[PDB]
């Protein structure tokens, strides 16, 4: 019932300081070693460091000795990696594993992992407009309903339908990189076509680099 | 030495036999660090499959084994299903350099999927992007198979060159993929013409939907 939460930035600009933390819930940080591994989008993982759960002991990946520290924190049970003179090249997804105390090293937990993002231009968040409902792509009697993210700089956009109540239906597509270097995506959902009038939606839209946390209701706007 | 290495794709045949090799050393495995096998989906945490060479945790399915010889081990798969489709990395601790490595990844690939034809939706702007000046075309592409797609716009009768940006075609969770063109125009643009098309095009076959300023 271990969880793993991590916090941190989303953007990093170049020769800044990357600091993310994992927070564990459910289990303390003693009786393990507690690991950081970072995968470039496209690429596979890479192991950066573990520290030891119960003593002060850590090791680092060689390549990234100079740059990396990892520490911990007991009292609030979790611990922390901090990477020195970032650039483009520690652009990753980040996740924060546990391993066993023992000396062998298989990863059983994973975080969710947190996209970093290594670039001098600013954070944007996004502006979110409904999609009115339409019927003639879909079959058998339903309706889609969609809410368009535009213009963020960074990536990770996450979107859910009525506040995560409606599940069902949901497609978010890949975000699509415009030619000023933000992002934009779609959410669409496809509901019963009867229920658009009894029945409200809204789309929760999180851009956390930018801390914003938008819900648009999608009214009928035509019929 | 001192590296783990494994073919960038295999390819299997749906409930056949396939295996991926994971090649090492002097250093890593033929020092006998165990190799361990993850598994990762699109848009997951790598899922960990087997562990000290051949064993299994709770939770993993017995088609799923391992094997190690020398500096070289292997993940075999029987009865391929189109699930099992997926990046799969070995990793192994090093002596040398006293770190735990990874492999760069094999991606597995079934042979029996057929081809799809993709649905397309078409969302004409709102008047709020209208008004904010980012009124934008939305055509959403899924549920097709075959990852080549072509898109196309059409302004009444012609193509716009400008202001499209199509994303490339990325798998979901059933296999498929999926794809989004985005159209931005301003609102004497979308005011001024007649209809605009979004024209997809998978396999000779084209599908196009048109949308119109009425009101």
């Known amino acids: 019932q271990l969880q793993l939460q991590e916090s941190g930035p989303g953007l990093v600009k170049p020769s800044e300081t990357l600091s993310l933390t994992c927070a564990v819930s459910?289990?303390?940080?003693?009786?393990?070693?507690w690991s950081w591994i970072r995968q470039p989008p496209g690429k596979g993982p890479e192991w950066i460091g573990f520290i030891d759960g119960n003593t002060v002991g850590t090791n680092y990946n060689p390549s990234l000795k100079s740059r990396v520290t990892l520490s911990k924190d007991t009292s609030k049970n979790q611990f922390s990696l901090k990477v020195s003179s970032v650039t483009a090249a520690d652009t990753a997804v980040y996740y924060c594993?546990?391993?066993?105390?023992?000396?062998?090293?298989?990863?059983?937990?994973w975080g969710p992992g947190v996209l970093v993002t290594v670039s001098s231009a600013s954070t944007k968040g996004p502006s979110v407009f409904p999609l009115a409902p339409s019927s003639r792509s879909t079959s058998e009697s339903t309706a889609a309903l969609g809410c368009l993210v535009k213009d963020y700089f960074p990536e990770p956009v996450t979107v859910s339908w009525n506040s995560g109540a409606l599940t069902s239906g949901v497609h978010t597509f890949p975000a699509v990189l415009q030619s000023s270097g933000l992002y934009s995506l779609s959410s669409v959902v496809t509901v019963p076509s009867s229920s658009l009038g009894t029945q409200t939606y809204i789309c929760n839209v999180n851009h956390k680099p930018s801390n914003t946390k938008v819900d648009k209701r999608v009214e009928i706007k035509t019929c | 030495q001192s590296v783990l290495t494994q073919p960038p794709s295999v390819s299997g045949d749906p409930g056949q036999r396939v295996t991926i090799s994971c090649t090492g050393s002097?250093?890593?495995?033929?020092?006998?660090?165990?190799v361990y096998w993850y598994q990762q989906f699109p848009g997951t945490a790598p899922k960990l499959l087997i562990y000290?060479?051949?064993k299994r945790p709770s939770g993993v399915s017995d088609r799923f084994s391992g094997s190690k010889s020398g500096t070289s081990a292997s993940l075999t798969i029987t009865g391929l299903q189109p699930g099992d489709e997926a990046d799969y990395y070995c990793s192994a601790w090093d002596s040398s350099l006293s770190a735990v490595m990874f492999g760069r990844g094999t991606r597995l690939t079934v042979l029996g999927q057929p081809k799809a034809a993709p649905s397309v939706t078409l969302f004409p702007p709102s008047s709020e992007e209208l008004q904010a000046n980012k009124a934008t075309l939305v055509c959403l592409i899924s549920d097709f198979y075959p990852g080549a797609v072509e898109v196309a716009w059409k302004a009444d009768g012609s193509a716009v060159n400008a202001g499209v940006e199509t994303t490339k075609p990325s798998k979901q969770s059933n296999n498929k993929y999926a794809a989004s063109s985005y159209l931005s125009l301003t609102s004497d643009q979308w005011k001024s013409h007649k209809s605009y098309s979004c024209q997809v095009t998978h396999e000779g076959s084209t599908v196009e939907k048109t949308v119109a300023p009425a009101e």
């Open positions: 000290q060479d051949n």
């Open positions: 594993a546990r391993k066993p105390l023992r000396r062998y090293f298989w990863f059983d937990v």
């Open positions: 002097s250093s890593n495995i033929g020092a006998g660090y165990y």
């Open positions: 459910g289990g303390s940080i003693s009786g393990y070693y």
